[PDB]
C-alpha cells in the first residue's frame, strides 16, 4: 500500500504522543529513551500512536523495555501494558491491575505485569493464582471493558533489575491475524482474529503505571513498521427529533485525502441543517460524523364557509399536518351550526372521505345562503247593510255584498327575520255594488239605495250601513 510506513527511533514523537507522567520527560535522542513512569508512587504515563493500524496489514514492533530496579517483594510496581482498541487514538486504559488495557471497550493486547493483583475490581479480573508475587507476561481480553489475563498466555519474565533494558518484539500477520511477542527469550503466540473482528483499524497505546510500589519504567529504540489505517466519515440522515429517516453512508479513505457527502433528497422531508462535521473535507485518524437534519413536510387544508346572501366569509377552518396524515375533519357539524341558525346548504367541495395533507395546499368551500320561507297574507273587506225597523226589529235579511279579497306574498329570511312583503293584489276587484233597498208594503226606507263605493284598498275598513223603515 502507499500507507506502509516504518517509524524510526529519531521520529518517535512525530508518530507517538507522550501522555500523563510521560509528558514530563523529553525524548533523549542520545539513548532514544522515553520515560513512561519515573521511580515515584501513583504515576501513570503512556505514548498513544497518532494514527490507527490497518489490522489487515502486517506490523513489526521492535525495541527495549526497562521494567525498573525493584521486584514486587522489594516494592516494585506495576508493569507496562500494550493496548489495542477500536475507539479514539487519544484513549488509554486504567492503571494498576488493568495494566493500561482494562476500562476500554474492544480492548486487547500484551502486559508485562510486575505486580500481582489477586483482589480484582471492575477494571480487571484477578491475576492468575499460579503467578502469586511473580513477574509474568500475558495477553489480555479487554473487550467487555474488564481486562481478563489469558492464563494460556501467562508466562514468567525476568524481574526488573538495575534499570536494565530487555529486548521486546511484537509481530503481526494481517492475513493470519496472529500476534508474536518475544521478551528476552520468552516467546508468545495468539490468534487475535477473535478480537480484531471486522474493524481492521485499531488504536495503539503503550502505558506504564506505578502505585504504592514503584519502578522506573522506560522505552528505548522503538522501530514500528505498519500500515497507517484510513479515516472513516459517517453521514447520518435523521429527522428533527433524532429518528433516522434514510440509510447512513460510512465512507472510508486515506488520511489527509478528501471526503464528500451527499445531501440526500428524502420524500416527505426537506433539508434543515448539517450539525457535526463539514459535508466536505479531508479524512482524519479518528471517525468524523456529519448529521443531515430534515424537517417533516407540512400540508395545508383551508375549508371556507360563505354566506352567498352577503358574499361574506362566515367561518374558515385552517388545518395543517404532515404530508400524508389524515385531517379527521368533517363539515357536517359546522354546517349543522349554520343550518340550525336558518341557513341552507348550497354546495360542499369538502371530500366525503375526510382528506389527507399533501405538499400542495387544498382549499375547499361550503356555500350557504340565508333561507327564505314564502308564506301568503289574505285580507278581506266586506260591506254589510242592515235593514231594520224603528224598534230595531229586522225588516229584511242583512245584505253581505260580494267580499273584496286581497292576497300578498310574505318572504321571511330565516336568519335576519327580515320579512320582505310582495304587494297587495285584489282577487275580486276594487269596487262594491249599488244595493237598492228592498220595498216593504206600507213602509218607507230612510235611504232607498246605498251607493256603490270605488277605491277599495286592502287596508280599507269594512263598510257597515243601516236602513231604517218607517210605518207608512
Ligand atoms: O502499586 C501497587 C498498588 O498500589 C495501590 O494499591 C493501587 O494504586 C494498585 O492498583 C497498585 O497496583
Ligand atoms: Ca497485576
Automatic annotation (TrEMBL):
GO molecular function: metal ion binding
Keywords of this entry: Calcium, Cell wall, Membrane, Metal-binding, Peptidoglycan-anchor, Repeat, Secreted, Signal, Transmembrane, Transmembrane helix
Keyword Cell inner membrane assigned: no
Binding positions for Ca(2+) per the UniProt entry: 113, 115, 117, 127
Superkingdom: Bacteria
UniProt protein name: Gram-positive cocci surface proteins LPxTG domain-containing protein
Organism: Lactococcus lactis subsp. lactis A12
Taxon lineage: Bacteria, Bacillati, Bacillota, Bacilli, Lactobacillales
Amino acid at each position: 500500500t502507499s500507507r506502509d510506513i516504518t517509524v524510526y527511533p529519531k521520529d518517535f514523537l512525530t508518530y507517538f504522543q507522550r501522555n500523563g507522567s510521560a509528558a514530563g520527560f523529553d525524548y533523549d535522542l542520545a539513548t532514544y529513551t522515553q520515560t513512561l513512569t519515573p521511580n515515584k508512587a501513583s504515576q501513570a504515563g503512556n505514548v498513544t500512536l497518532k494514527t490507527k493500524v490497518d489490522m489487515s496489514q502486517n506490523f513489526t514492533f521492535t525495541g527495549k523495555i526497562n521494567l525498573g530496579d525493584k521486584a514486587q517483594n522489594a516494592g516494585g510496581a506495576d508493569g507496562v501494558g500494550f493496548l489495542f482498541h477500536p475507539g479514539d487514538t487519544n484513549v488509554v486504559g486504567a492503571p494498576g491491575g488493568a495494566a493500561g488495557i482494562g476500562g476500554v471497550n474492544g480492548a486487547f493486547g500484551f502486559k508485562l505485569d510486575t505486580y500481582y493483583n489477586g483482589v480484582g475490581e471492575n477494571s480487571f479480573t484477578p491475576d492468575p493464582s499460579n503467578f502469586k508475587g511473580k513477574p509474568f507476561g500475558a495477553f489480555v481480553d479487554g473487550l467487555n471493558g474488564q481486562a481478563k489475563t489469558i492464563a494460556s498466555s501467562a508466562q514468567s519474565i525476568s524481574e526488573p533489575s538495575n534499570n536494565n533494558f530487555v529486548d521486546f518484539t511484537m509481530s503481526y500477520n494481517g492475513a493470519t491475524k496472529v500476534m508474536s511477542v518475544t521478551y528476552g527469550g520468552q516467546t508468545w503466540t495468539q490468534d487475535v482474529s477473535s478480537f480484531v473482528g471486522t474493524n481492521q483499524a485499531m488504536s495503539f497505546s503503550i502505558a506504564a503505571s506505578t502505585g504504592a510500589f514503584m519502578n522506573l519504567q522506560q522505552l528505548r529504540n522503538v522501530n514500528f513498521t505498519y500500515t497507517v489505517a484510513q479515516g472513516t466519515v459517517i453521514a447520518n440522515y435523521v429527522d428533527e427529533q433524532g429518528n433516522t429517516i434514510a440509510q447512513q453512508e460510512t465512507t472510508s479513505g486515506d488520511i489527509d485525502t478528501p471526503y464528500v457527502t451527499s445531501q440526500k433528497t428524502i420524500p416527505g422531508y426537506t433539508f434543515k441543517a448539517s450539525n457535526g462535521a463539514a459535508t466536505s473535507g479531508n479524512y482524519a485518524a479518528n471517525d468524523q460524523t456529519v448529521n443531515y437534519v430534515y424537517t417533516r413536510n407540512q400540508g395545508s387544508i383551508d375549508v371556507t364557509y360563505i354566506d352567498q346572501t352577503t358574499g361574506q366569509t362566515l367561518s374558515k377552518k385552517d388545518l395543517s399536518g404532515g404530508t400524508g396524515d389524515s385531517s379527521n375533519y368533517t363539515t357536517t357539524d359546522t354546517i349543522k351550526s349554520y343550518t340550525d341558525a336558518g341557513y341552507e346548504l348550497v354546495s360542499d367541495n369538502y371530500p366525503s372521505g375526510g382528506t389527507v395533507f399533501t405538499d400542495t395546499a387544498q382549499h375547499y368551500v361550503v356555500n350557504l345562503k340565508q333561507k327564505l320561507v314564502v308564506s301568503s297574507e289574505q285580507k278581506q273587506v266586506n260591506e254589510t247593510i242592515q235593514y231594520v225597523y224603528e224598534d230595531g226589529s229586522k225588516a229584511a235579511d242583512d245584505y253581505n255584498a260580494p267580499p273584496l279579497n286581497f292576497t300578498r306574498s310574505v318572504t321571511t329570511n330565516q336568519v335576519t327575520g327580515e320579512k320582505t312583503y310582495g304587494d297587495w293584489q285584489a282577487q275580486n276587484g276594487d269596487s262594491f255594488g249599488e244595493v237598492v233597498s228592498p220595498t216593504i208594503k206600507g213602509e218607507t226606507a230612510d235611504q232607498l239605495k246605498i251607493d256603490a263605493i270605488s277605491g277599495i284598498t286592502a287596508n280599507s275598513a269594512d263598510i257597515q250601513k243601516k236602513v231604517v223603515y218607517k210605518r207608512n
